[PDB]
């Protein structure tokens, strides 16, 4: 929690939990390959329960859900996915974050199983489904909307 409150960030802009959820994390050629698997369910669960910034964004504009749905092995260790997906949605992690290249993680699921999991964990909700339209059609929100709604639109 001390490190997370200090919040280190990678060169690629990934937060610590972003480094926890990805699959391209390099692992040392020694016995870490035996046990340090990625993405890891327990690591992400303990990081989120410890107080990680779940809505942290990278330099690529994505969130943790965007990275985890892009996993290349969805049915190899599906339970881990079924853990981490039920982890992040349990604490923040807006399921329709819509990264800076106008891509919701549902559109970046790239897998039927992952998109089924996300749809089961998606929520019929507020001005997120009622904001995808107002950001698809360019309506001026520049101080035409509340101040927290500026970042709300900037996500959605």
């Amino acid at each position: 929690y001390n490190l997370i409150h200090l919040d280190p960030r990678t060169r690629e802009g990934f937060t610590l939990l972003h480094l926890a959820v990805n699959s391209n994390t390099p692992v040392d050629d020694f016995h870490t390959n035996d046990v340090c698997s990625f993405p890891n369910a327990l690591v992400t669960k303990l990081l989120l329960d410890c107080g990680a910034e779940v809505n942290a964004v990278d330099n690529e504009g994505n969130s943790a859900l965007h990275i985890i749905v892009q996993y290349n092995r969805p049915i190899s260790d599906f339970l881990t996915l079924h853990s981490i997906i039920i982890s992040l949605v349990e604490a923040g992690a807006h399921t329709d974050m819509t990264n800076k290249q106008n891509k919701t993680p549902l559109d970046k699921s790239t897998t039927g199983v992952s998109e089924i999991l996300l749809k089961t964990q998606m929520k019929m909700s507020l001005k997120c489904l009622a904001a995808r339209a107002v950001r698809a059609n360019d309506i001026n929100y520049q101080d035409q909307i509340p101040r927290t709604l500026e970042e709300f639109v900037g996500f959605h």
């Binding site: 001005k127 009622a130 339209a133 709604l149």
Partner: protein, 96 residues
């Protein structure tokens, strides 16, 4: 059983109490002070939102109840561009 919602532009909208309870503000407004303890009407005023958006959330109130988690072929929501940025000032006031 049913709740009444009064829009800014004179319009009064009546929907199921459970359907309007999906938004936190209505839950907050109906509870505590201003409860209007008649258990049948429970009218609430809204001098900020216009009539169409209050009709739009009432459409959305029934939309959420029907499709909480079932019928995976979920129909989308046809939000008009002319009603966009107006409902974008409403749901945060409603905590839907």
């Amino acid at each position: 059983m049913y709740v009444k919602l009064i829009s800014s532009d004179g319009h009064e909208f009546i929907v199921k109490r459970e359907h309007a309870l999906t938004s936190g503000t209505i839950k907050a407004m109906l509870s505590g002070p201003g409860q209007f303890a008649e258990n049948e009407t429970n009218e609430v005023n809204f001098r900020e939102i216009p009539s169409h958006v209050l009709s739009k959330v009432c459409m959305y109130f029934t939309y959420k109840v029907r499709y909480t988690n079932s019928s995976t072929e979920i129909p989308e929501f046809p939000i008009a561009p002319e009603i966009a940025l107006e409902l974008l000032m409403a749901a945060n006031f409603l905590d839907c």
